[PDB]
Amino acid sequence: ARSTNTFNYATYHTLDEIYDFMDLLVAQHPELVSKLQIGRSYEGRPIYVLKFSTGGSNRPAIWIDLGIHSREWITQATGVWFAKKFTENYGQNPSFTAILDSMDIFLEIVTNPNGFAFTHSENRLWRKTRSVTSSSLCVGVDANRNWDAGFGKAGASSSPCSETYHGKYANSEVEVKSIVDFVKNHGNFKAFLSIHSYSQLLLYPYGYTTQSIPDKTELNQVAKSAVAALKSLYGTSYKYGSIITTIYQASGGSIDWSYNQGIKYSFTFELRDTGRYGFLLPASQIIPTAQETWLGVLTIMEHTVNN
């Protein structure tokens, strides 16, 4: 509210409540966190990325994104808990401090800011951004069908009223171009994780094809390891494997792209539920979800530093 110790992590908040928390966090830890604006949304809202650093060069960074899909609320809210938790574990947990002492972390909580505010005042089940343009009457692109990874091939729909609608070209979406340019400038991303909701799955490339990643073995095992660790806290059981293999063929997804860029540890997390609640996961389920899902992101990081 007026303090990150007093901001309620076990409630669903709004854009304004979160662009705001991001401001408390930095003001609290200007030596650990910075707030970066990597772009401005479709409908003009700033896109913020939060960088967590103990200093150094152009240290190898870890990228974590939340909310590419607005309806999937537990990710923005897991998102807020990670920021809080980075700031507290540093210098506390040797593991966690080891990693900040070698790598920078890049945290993006509301990747799709337009669509999220849309879920609040209009439709709770909006999944796409709020881009107009098209032979359309029909707004928005599935931003996880817009990246340049088998773009516009099966797994993405060509009609604009579609839920899985891919945009007219790859990165057409500014929410999507920001990250890309950004990821691409830095050039020292050795990890890329994308958080989604719901179903309890830890996914690695590919989405748009059957061919299997060279690093298939590695990722399987880290995946293996990382699903193990999440299950340790509350016993939540996940499944893991390629996307094409365990949910559905999805051309143009985020992980697909980062992977082909050379971001080896590129994983997609599908958080809780399994469907009772699905997109409307009750609030009493955030701390839990965040704590387990951190044990899992943590695993992927130790791995990232180890090799």
Partner: protein, 37 residues
């Protein structure tokens, strides 16, 4: 009538999911219409 009749329907294509407004993806691991996550 009350939301998505098709959700939880046994699937095999995305096509075998007539048209739920909600559950319109086949999940290749619970071969059931569910929504896109």
């Amino acid at each position: 009538x009350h939301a998505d009749p098709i959700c939880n329907k046994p699937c095999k294509t995305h096509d075998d999911c007539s048209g739920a407004w909600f559950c319109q993806a086949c999940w290749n691991s619970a071969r059931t219409c569910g929504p896109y996550v």
